[PDB]
Amino acid sequence: FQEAYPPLCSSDAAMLRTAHAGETGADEVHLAQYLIRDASPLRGCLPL
């Protein structure tokens, strides 16, 4: 038929890593880059 699944991103992931592993980056964005995200299945397994 037609439509689509996904996970959570950040591209300047100079919007990626400070100290968490949980629920961290969600406001879409920080300066001029592209910060993709998250909507295929599994939330919170398997810590980083």
Binding site: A4, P6, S11, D12, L31, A32, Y34, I36, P47
Partner: protein
């Protein structure tokens, strides 16, 4: 399954000059690589600790042959009557004895 995927993408609709908490990718001075395009492609493989994909390959790759393409595609759509369009000008010539 399939999915699709990306290199930096851009928006269009000029509607996003906002701010929340800040002193930014900016120094004592003005404009080296920060008002500028994002970076790209990288990743984060098996069990907890992320990975690069910056700057190296599409050259085994689109020096490619089936793009100059003229036999069979246009072929498969021969026979109509081409929609409202005439010259604007395309013909050519050799002087003008003037």
């Amino acid at each position: 399954i399939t999915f699709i995927m990306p290199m930096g993408v851009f928006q269009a609709n000029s509607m996003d000059r906002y701010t929340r908490h800040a002193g930014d990718f900016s120094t004592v001075s003005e404009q080296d690589p920060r008002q500028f395009p994002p970076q790209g492609i990288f990743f984060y493989n098996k069990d907890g600790i992320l990975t690069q994909l910056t700057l190296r390959d599409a050259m085994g790759t689109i020096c490619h042959s089936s793009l100059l393409d003229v036999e069979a595609t246009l072929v498969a759509l021969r026979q109509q009557h081409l929609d409202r369009q005439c010259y604007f000008g395309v013909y050519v010539a050799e002087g003008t004895e003037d």
